[PDB]
Every structure is written in C-alpha cells, then in structure tokens.
C-alpha cells in the first residue's frame, strides 16, 4: 500500500499540524508500539502527546488493542472514509448559500426577502417602508458575498480538483486494490 502511504502523506500535510502528522506517519508503518515507547520515540510531553493521541483517536484516526497496557495503531479504513467526509464538506460548500432576492433597511440593518416585499410596500410613497422603523430599503449584501469572494473559493475548489484528480486516480487504484 505504498500509494496509500503517500496518499496518507498528502493527508497529514493538508490536515493537522506537524506533530500530528509525525505521529500519524510513524503509525502508518503498522506500528503497535507501547505508549511509553511511543513517548520515548517521539520525545513529546506525556500528557500532551496523550492529548494529541486522544484528539486523533476521537475523530477516528486511531485504533487500539488492550494488551492493562494500552497500544495504538492506525485505523483500518484507508483514509477514503476521511476523504469522503471532506468531499461532503466541499460538496456542502459548492452549494449556493446566497439568495438572489434581497432588500435591507439601512437603519436596523435587518434583512428581508422577496417574500416580505409584497407586505413591506407603502402606497403613499410608491416604494418600501420597513416594519418597525419605516425607511427605504435597497439591496442587502449582509453576511453575504458582494463580489468574487465565495466564487473565488468555488474557483479555488475548481483549482483543487485537478491537483486532486491524480489522488482520485490514487483512489481508483486503491479501489481496484480491494481485490488484493
């Protein structure tokens, strides 16, 4: 699983810090080392390394063997589980959160939609008057992208996708590798 080893080397760099990356890396070689031994090998602080180990174990990066001696080893799922979850994270993002229908009152900075426009009308002025502090409303752009920026992240996501294509192929090879 040399490909998976490298795909993992990708995952450590992208994800957490180098301490975590270092701990994951030693484990990738099918480590079953004693925690005290893993402490001496790593030379971290015992409590804090354990904090690293608990942070990694809970998100589900780690598996154990109760030997009452405690032993740690990389969970046997081969990242894909992590990647699938991450893809959903990206897949959620990708979806538009900005409404194409949007007035706001400058005074109260509240937000309103097309749905409220048929009620926020006032015929004596021929335009819109707010509910609790009647003032003219114009556009919104509140807690929302004005220009480019969510889109730049979507373009960023697009930029990510080719450099992830090879990794998707790494996955393809891994997925054929599930005969072996």
């Amino acid at each position: 699983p040399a490909a998976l080893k490298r795909l993992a080397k990708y995952v450590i760099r992208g994800f957490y810090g180098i301490e975590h990356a270092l701990a994951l890396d030693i484990l990738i070689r099918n480590s079953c080392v004693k925690e005290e031994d893993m402490l001496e090998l790593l030379k971290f602080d015992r409590k804090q390394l354990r904090s690293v180990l608990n942070n990694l174990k809970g998100d589900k990066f780690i598996k154990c063997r109760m030997r009452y001696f405690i032993n740690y080893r990389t969970l046997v799922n081969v990242v894909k589980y992590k990647l699938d979850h991450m893809r959903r994270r990206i897949e959620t993002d990708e979806r538009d959160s900005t409404n194409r229908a949007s007035f706001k009152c400058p005074v109260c900075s509240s937000t309103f939609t097309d749905l409220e426009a048929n009620q926020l009308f006032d015929p004596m002025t021929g335009t819109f008057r707010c509910t609790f502090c009647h003032t003219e409303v114009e556009e919104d752009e509140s807690a929302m992208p004005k220009k480019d920026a969510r889109t730049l992240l979507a373009r960023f996501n697009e930029q990510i996708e080719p450099i992830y294509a090879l990794l998707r192929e790494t996955e393809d090879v891994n997925l054929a590798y599930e005969i072996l």
């Binding site: 760099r13 992208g14 180098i18």
Partner: protein
C-alpha cells in the same frame, strides 16, 4: 567524589570548546593541577568510576568520545539531520548546543531547508523534525478545516454514505 564530578563538567566544557583529543586521568589531574588528590583516590576514580561511566570509551590506556555517546563531526551533521526516511527520528536542542556552537544560527539555517521546530517537553525544550508536503489551499488557515471534517459521532459517516447512493 566531588572532584570527579568537576572533572566531568570540565570534560563537557573542553569538548564544547573543541578539544576532542583522547587523554588520560593523569593528564587531567595535571592540567587541573589536582595531582595531590592522593594515589588511593586517583586509582579508585580511574579503575572503578571512569570505567563504569558509560560516557567515555577506553582505548588501550586512554579515554575517547569524551563527554558522552557522540559522533561530533563539527556539529555539521547534515546527513544525520537528513537521515533518509528515518529522518533522525528526532534531534534535541540541548544536544546540538552541547555539541559545539550555539544552535540558533544553525536552526535559522535549518528552518530554510526542510526542518521544523516544536516546543516539546516544557515549551522550553525544542525538538527538530523533517517535513515535506506543502499545505494544499490558501484559506485563512483553520476556519475551513474546522468546518470540513466528518462528525466525531457514529451514523454521521453512514448519512454521508446514504446521501451518495
């Protein structure tokens, strides 16, 4: 007893200064002008203590590798710092400083090669390691990563699987 401990500290200092040359107990007594420690004590120090001390290597009639298990080389252990896939496993800030010169200049140089520093043990201790792959997207570094993961909790992953199918 005290005299020997002073010898060891001197010996570390002399190694730091650069004098890695092999020498004898008689020579150290001389150079420190403490030959009048008495032949009984001299002998006991020589043929019991400084033979049971694992920090020195006895060669023929003289002591080598001086202060401890070391390889010295001008503290320019670049290959050692490299060390292929093993990657040192991990160097210590204290050992490099003890080695010859202060670490800081070397570390600064090492920070612009492939090395990373972590504040191990007591934030005051530092370890060096070898990184490789760059980070994959310029986000604000930490807000998107916090949002991106699979729920720590069971059946979440199964809800992601079900949404895919």
């Amino acid at each position: 007893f005290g005299v020997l401990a002073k010898i060891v500290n001197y010996m570390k200092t002399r190694h730091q200064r650069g004098d890695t040359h092999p020498l004898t107990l008689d020579e150290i007594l001389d150079e420190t002008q403490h030959l009048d420690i008495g032949l009984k004590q001299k002998q006991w120090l020589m043929t019991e203590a400084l033979v049971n001390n694992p920090k020195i290597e006895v060669i023929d009639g003289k002591y080598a590798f001086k202060p401890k298990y070391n390889v010295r080389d001008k503290k320019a252990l670049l290959r050692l710092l490299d060390q292929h896939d093993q990657r040192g496993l991990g160097g210590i800030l204290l050992e490099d400083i003890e080695e010859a010169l202060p670490n800081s200049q070397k570390a600064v140089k090492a920070l612009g090669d492939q090395i990373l520093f972590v504040n191990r043990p007591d934030k005051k201790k530092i370890l060096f390691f070898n990184d490789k792959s760059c980070q994959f997207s310029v986000d604000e570094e930490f807000q998107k990563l916090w949002r991106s993961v699979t729920v720590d909790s069971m059946d979440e992953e199964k809800i992601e699987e079900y949404l895919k199918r």
